[PDB]
Homo-oligomer: A and B are copies of this chain.
Amino acid sequence: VGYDDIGGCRKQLAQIKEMVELPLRHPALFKAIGVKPPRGILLYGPPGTGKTLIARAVANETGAFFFLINGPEIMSKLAGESESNLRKAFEEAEKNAPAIIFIDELDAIAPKREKTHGEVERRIVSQLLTLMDGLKQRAHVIVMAATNRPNSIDPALRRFGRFDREVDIGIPDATGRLEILQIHTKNMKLADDVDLEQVANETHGHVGADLAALCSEAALQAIRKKMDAEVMNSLAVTMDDFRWALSQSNPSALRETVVEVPQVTWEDIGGLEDVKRELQELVQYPVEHPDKFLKFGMTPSKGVLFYGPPGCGKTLLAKAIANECQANFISIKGPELLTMWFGESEANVREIFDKARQAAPCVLFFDELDSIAKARGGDRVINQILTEMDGMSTKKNVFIIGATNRPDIIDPAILRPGRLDQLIYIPLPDEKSRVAILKANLRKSPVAKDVDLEFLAKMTNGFSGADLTEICQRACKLAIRESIESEIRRERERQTPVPEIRRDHFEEAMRFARRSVSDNDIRKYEMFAQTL
Given the complex, which residues of B lie within 8 Å of A123, measured CB to CB?
75-78
Minimum C-beta distance from A450 to chain B (A): 16
Chain B residues with CB under 8 Å of A281's CB are: 480-481, 484
Beta-carbon contact of A480 and B70 below 8 Å: no
Please report the C-alpha to C-alpha distance between residue A514 and residue B422 in the assembled complex, in whole angstroms.
Answer: 13
| Contact across chains for A72 and B108 when beta carbons are under 8 A apart | no
The CA of A48 and the CA of B164, in the complex, are separated in Å by 12
Cβ contact of A445, chosen from B159, B296, B383, B501, cutoff 8 A: B296
Q: CB-CB < 8 A to A445: which residues of B?
A: 296-298
Query: Given A108-B126, A479-B296, A484-B285, do A393 and B209 touch, yes or no (CB 8 Å)?
Result: no
Q: Which of A262-270, A333-341, A455-463 lies at the interface?
A: A333-341
Shortest distance between the CB of A300 and any CB in chain B (Å): 9
Chain B residues within 8 Å of A32, by CB: 229, 232
- Copies of this chain, count: 2
A335/B483 in contact, CB under 8 A: no
A18 partner residues in chain B, CB cutoff 8 A: 220, 223-224
Residue-wise, chain A 121-153 has the 8 Å CB interface mask toward B (1 for contact) of 111001101100100000000000000000000
Note all chain B residues with C-beta closer than 8 A to A47: 159-160
* Given known A343-B380, A383-B335, contact A285–B480 (CB-CB < 8 A): yes
- The answer on a CB contact under 8 Å between B476 and A296 is yes
If the complex has contacts A35-B216, A36-B215, A72-B133, are A384 and B289 also in contact, measured as CB distance less than 8 A? no
- Given known contacts A156-B72, A446-B295, is B36 in contact with A213 (CB within 8 Å)? yes
Q: CB within 8 A of A357: which of B219, B224, B251?
A: B251
Say yes or no for A22: interface residue by CB 8 A criterion.
Answer: yes
- Tell me if B70 and A130 are in contact (CB < 8 A): yes
Instruction: State how many angstroms separate the Cβ of A194 from the closest Cβ of chain B.
Output: 13
Main secondary structure of the interface of A (DSSP, over half): helix
| A519 interfacial by beta-carbon distance below 8 Å | no
Among B22, B72, B250, B336, the residue within 8 A (CB) of A358 is B250
The interface-forming segment of A90-98, A172-180, A241-249, A320-328 is A241-249
Q: What chain B residues lie within 8 Å of A29 (beta carbons)?
A: 229, 232
In the assembly, what is the distance between CA of A13 and CA of B151, in Å? 35
Q: Mark A468-502, 1 if CB is under 8 A from B, else 0.
A: 00101100110111011001000000000001010
Q: Which residues of B contact A444 (CB under 8 A)?
A: 297
B contact residues around A118 at 8 Å (CB): 119, 122
Q: B298–A476 contact, CB under 8 A? A: yes
User: A285 CA to B111 CA in the complex, in Å?
Assistant: 51
Q: Determine if A396 is an interface residue (Cβ-Cβ < 8 Å).
A: yes
Q: Is A527 an interface residue (CB 8 A)?
A: no
Residue A187, interface by CB 8 Å: yes
Interface residues of A (CB under 8 A from B): 18-19, 22, 26, 28-29, 32-36, 38, 47-48, 70, 72-73, 75-78, 83, 105, 108, 111, 113-115, 117-123, 126-127, 129-130, 133, 156, 159-161, 187, 204-205, 207, 209, 212-213, 215-216, 219-220, 223-224, 229, 232, 235, 243, 246-247, 249-252, 254-255, 281, 285, 288-290, 292-293, 295-298, 333-336, 338-339, 342-343, 357-358, 360, 371, 379-380, 383-384, 386-387, 390-391, 393, 395-396, 413, 417, 444-446, 466, 470, 472-473, 476-477, 479-481, 483-484, 487, 499, 501, 514, 532
14 A–B contact pairs at CB < 8 A?
A28-B229, A29-B229, A35-B216, A35-B219, A38-B216, A70-B133, A108-B113, A114-B115, A289-B484, A296-B446, A298-B472, A298-B477, A333-B390, A339-B383
